[PDB]
Design a protein around this ligand. Structure first.
Ligand SMILES: CCC(=O)NS(=O)(=O)c1ccc(NC(=O)COc2ccc(Cl)cc2C(=O)c2cc(Cl)cc(C#N)c2)c(C)c1
Lengths: 537, 405
């Protein structure tokens, strides 16, 4: 049952020594039950009774099958053990799996215990079974195999598994074998009887190296319930999500509900959480009870219906095109679907409102395209052909003259409104015939009062005093007044370094209420020229 | 041969850089290349007890693929070996050619104790499978420790061609060889084959003109008539240039901006303004005095996107004290790809720093980290990789440099 597998040389961190924590005394029941277990493990050759020598020790507990089960707390040993190669944390996504005629899932039962431990490291895992009467030595043992709960086990087991499969893979190039934790998902396009024959081959090749396994009956059958999905042979779906139903909701209830709903937004279209989120305002405690408003009730009622919709996915065919289409659902919010053929989605998603100090729709679209691209390369090792809701000229007009390097892989236009456009464009030259506003702003950053105003060539002037304001705000408010009091065409002279920023970027969305006001006003004008000039005399 | 012990710098641990995702085609090429190297004993597979890692990727020329390892982190953590100096002549030559000699390294064993630090990972698609781990048994390409440890062997193999050609100069950096002469193109090129065939004789391989890299002059605009707007824009740039040249004045021009005149109105330049504009032009005819290169300082390279495919840049150590400045233009077939143009500029500029000072500068790139990291490899071709950071170009610096001649 143990394996002929070579052991992996393991070491303790630089400097420190093995653990030496004392054994937490236990009742006579829990002891006798441990003796039972540890005696059987000695039979299997998993642990070895030791003596005096070993200075180290780790606590052993007893928990409850309705019987007793051994538990060893390696927290300490672990923090003294070397670092291993990170076990992968990426989970395959069904949208990137290739459909197979047959699939057999095999889980390596007693994974860990079935692999030998580095002989030079065993002494560090010594533990002691107490005794009813104290003062009596107690049973001493150490591990001959990968301990369950020890820092190195997952990595060492995975590595072993990999080494054992390399030969089989080389002999069966057409067969695909997924490795995930201690689970193998095996698939082929062979005829069912052949497949079943090759599987039994694999099973016996594993048994050969000590890894036991599930045969045909004591197993798992499709659809497979894996990581929240339901995989069928012709497609996949997501396990239905259930939203509780109560007459009394606490703050915690609302936060969990909001979370599940937020997640469900990737898959389902019209999921909304606005009115439900409004419920958290000024909350004083997790257990606090917040009555639901009408809106929140309607919102919730509407979401329950949406979640009862049959959303299904399809698997990947490496012979057809990979295509992604994007939509602007709202300012800063995008939805996308990646597919191979019309209406058969491989996957869908949604990027929440990416707000900030200032950007423009064309920019955000760019970032959505890059996130989807990084995502596509991970899933399918390939970049999709994009279908973007933006005129080729808008793109060419933006990127052409943007101060930042930017790019979109091979794409195509698709007139599926609303389209992404440039909301306004500063003139490249002063406007002949349009009034010229000379604006300035300054204020006591200490008193937070101060003022900003303008004076034009046509004689128009004004000044406003601002209570509780700032420097950049007076500059900006200055520009704001000019835009407000001027006609459909204007020239504006400012010494503000910030406006200079607006010239180089020309944003359309922002955190600042002021900038927003300015943007609204800039979009209104038919022509606007903004000029910057050094400040001092 | 034998292996010379090698250590990291005091208190430094080994690199643990995450491997970025790769396209199916690059993975297949890397699997092919690595299965071959493994067969020849250059690299071996490794166990989970090795936690280190350096990222790897695949670049081109036409048919086959070349493997590129980014040992930038390992290099920093790698001890110092104070390689050869820097021939002040190489930069003064007339024509230099670059040769890839990374193959030379595969013949020398790497100290077994150091091997683990060179671990790398070939990723899989969709997480279907754990990566394929390897480490080097021999001097790897791209690690600063290789050229150094092979120095004694390289001098020994270059001596004959060197004694033969007292004039020509050879300078080594990483995996490349920079050879320069004053000869005639024809004799130059054919004189390279002579060297290559000599290298071929051991195992190594199977146009730059330094006398043109000259700091560029900033020329001010010239106009028949000057509008208020015209004068404001001229005054803004001069105001900035003053940070470089203190003698620039704007009092006279600025006096022409009193009042509240329409931006389009024409203003007559007084005689004073005339002179002031002339003194400033005179000052600008030459690079500012006093700039010299300091070897105890980092070299810095900044780039601004001018538009229409043009890219300006400056190399310096201290602000406003440029060692070199230039303009790189978009070339045939990039008319829709900023990324490809920036990568071409970085390499071209990094190459220049190597020839002149024997080191690579630290770059300030006007692009977003995500955009850069997702595509820079698609167009890289150097055996080396410079250091870099992402910035937000100030509107003025840009405006002033597009004023170049
Ligand atoms: C009644 C007909 C029938 O069900 N036929 S079948 O042999 O059972 C069969 C054949 C293929 C498939 N699946 C596919 O075509 C596409 O899926 C796959 C394609 C190749 C491989 Cl190796 C596994 C799967 C999985 O279904 C799978 C993947 C992962 Cl990461 C975990 C689990 C997990 N856990 C299962 C299924 C679900 C069942």
């Amino acid at each position: 049952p143990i394996s002929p597998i070579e052991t992996v040389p393991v070491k303790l961190k630089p400097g420190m020594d093995g653990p030496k924590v004392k054994q937490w005394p236990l009742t006579e029941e829990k002891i006798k039950a441990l003796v039972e277990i540890c005696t059987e493990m000695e039979k299997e050759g998993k642990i070895s009774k030791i003596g005096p020598e070993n200075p180290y020790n780790t606590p052993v507990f007893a928990i409850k099958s309705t019987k007793w089960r051994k538990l060893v707390d390696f927290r300490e040993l672990n923090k003294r053990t070397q670092d291993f190669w990170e076990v992968q944390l990426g989970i395959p996504h069904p949208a990137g799996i290739k459909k197979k005629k047959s699939v057999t899932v095999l889980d390596v039962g007693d994974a860990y215990f079935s692999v030998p431990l580095d002989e030079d490291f065993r002494k560090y895992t010594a533990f002691t079974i107490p005794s009813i009467n104290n003062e009596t030595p107690g049973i001493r043992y150490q591990y001959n195999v990968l301990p369950q709960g020890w820092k190195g086990s997952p990595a060492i087991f995975q590595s072993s598994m990999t080494k054992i499969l390399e030969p089989f893979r080389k002999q069966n190039p057409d067969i695909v074998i997924y490795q995930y934790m201690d689970d193998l998902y095996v698939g082929s396009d062979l005829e069912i009887g052949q497949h079943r024959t090759k599987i039994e081959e694999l099973r016996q090749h594993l048994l050969r190296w000590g890894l036991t396994t599930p045969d045909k009956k004591h197993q798992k059958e499709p659809p497979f319930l894996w990581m929240g999905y339901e995989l069928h042979p012709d497609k996949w779906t997501v396990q239905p999500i259930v939203l509780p139903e109560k007459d009394s909701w606490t703050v915690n209830d609302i936060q969990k509900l909001v979370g599940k709903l937020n997640w469900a937004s990737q898959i389902y279209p019209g999921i909304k959480v606005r009115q439900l989120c409004k419920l958290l305002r000024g909350t004083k405690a997790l257990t606090e009870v917040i009555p639901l408003t009408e809106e929140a009730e309607l919102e919730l009622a509407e979401n329950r219906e949406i979640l009862k919709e049959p959303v299904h996915g399809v698997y990947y065919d490496p012979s057809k095109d990979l295509i992604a289409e994007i939509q602007k659902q709202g300012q800063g919010q995008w939805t996308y679907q990646i597919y191979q053929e019309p209406f058969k989605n491989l996957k869908t998603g949604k990027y929440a409102r990416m707000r900030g100090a200032h950007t423009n729709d064309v920019k955000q679209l760019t970032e959505a395209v890059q996130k989807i691209t990084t995502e596509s390369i991970v899933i399918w090792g390939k970049t999709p052909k994009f279908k973007l809701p933006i005129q080729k000229e808008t793109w060419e007009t933006w990127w052409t003259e943007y101060w930042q390097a930017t790019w979109i892989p091979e794409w195509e236009f698709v007139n599926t409104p609303p389209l992404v456009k440039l909301w306004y464009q500063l003139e490249k030259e002063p406007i002949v015939g349009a009034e010229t506003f000379y604006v300035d702003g300054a204020a006591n950053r200490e008193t937070k009062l101060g003022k900003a105003g303008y004076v034009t060539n046509r004689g128009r002037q004004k000044v406003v005093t601002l209570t509780d304001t700032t420097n950049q705000k007076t500059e900006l408010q200055a520009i704001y007044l000019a835009l407000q009091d001027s006609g459909l065409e204007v020239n504006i002279v400012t010494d503000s370094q910030y406006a200079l920023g607006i010239i180089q970027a020309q944003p359309d969305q922002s955190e600042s209420e002021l900038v927003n006001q300015i943007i609204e006003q800039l979009i209104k004008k038919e022509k606007v020229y903004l000029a910057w000039v050094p400040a001092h005399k | 041969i034998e292996t010379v012990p090698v250590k990291l710098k005091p208190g430094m641990d080994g690199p643990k850089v995450k491997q970025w995702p790769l396209t199916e085609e690059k993975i297949k090429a890397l699997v092919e290349i690595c299965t071959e190297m493994e067969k020849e004993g250059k690299i071996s597979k490794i166990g989970p007890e090795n936690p280190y890692n350096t990222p790897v990727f695949a670049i081109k020329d036409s048919t086959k693929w070349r493997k590129l390892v980014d040992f930038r982190e390992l290099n920093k953590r790698t001890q110092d070996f104070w390689g050869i100096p820097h021939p002040a002549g190489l930069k003064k030559k007339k024509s230099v050619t670059v040769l890839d000699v990374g193959d030379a390294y595969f013949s020398v064993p790497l100290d077994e104790d150091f091997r683990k630090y060179t671990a790398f990972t070939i990723p899989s698609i969709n997480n279907e499978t754990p990566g394929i781990r390897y480490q080097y048994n021999v001097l790897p390409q791209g690690w600063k420790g290789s050229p150094a440890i092979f120095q004694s062997s390289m001098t020994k193999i270059l001596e004959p061609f060197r004694k033969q050609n007292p004039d020509i100069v050879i300078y080594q950096y990483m995996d490349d060889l920079y050879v320069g002469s004053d000869l005639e193109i024809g004799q130059h090129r054919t004189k390279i084959e002579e060297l290559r065939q000599h290298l071929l004789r051991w195992g190594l391989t199977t146009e730059l003109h330094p006398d043109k890299w000259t700091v560029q002059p900033i020329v001010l605009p010239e106009k028949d008539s000057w509008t208020v707007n015209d004068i404001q824009k001229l005054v803004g740039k001069l105001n900035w240039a003053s940070q470089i040249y203190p003698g620039i004045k704007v009092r006279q021009l600025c006096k022409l901006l009193r009042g509240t005149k329409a931006l389009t109105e024409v203003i007559p330049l007084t005689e004073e303004a005339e002179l002031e504009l002339a003194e400033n032009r005179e000052i600008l005819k030459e690079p500012v005095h006093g700039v010299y290169y300091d070897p105890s300082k980092d070299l810095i390279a900044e780039i601004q996107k001018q538009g229409q495919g043009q890219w300006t840049y400056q190399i310096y150590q201290e602000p406003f004290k440029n060692l070199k400045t230039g303009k790189y233009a978009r070339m045939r077939g990039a008319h829709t790809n900023d990324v490809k143009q920036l990568t071409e500029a970085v390499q071209k500029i990094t190459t220049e720093s190597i020839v002149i000072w024997g080191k690579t500068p630290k770059f300030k790139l006007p692009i977003q980290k995500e955009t850069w990291e997702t595509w820079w490899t698609e167009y890289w071709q150097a055996t080396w990789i410079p250091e870099w950071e992402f910035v937000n170009t100030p509107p003025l610096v840009k405006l002033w440099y597009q004023l170049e001649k």
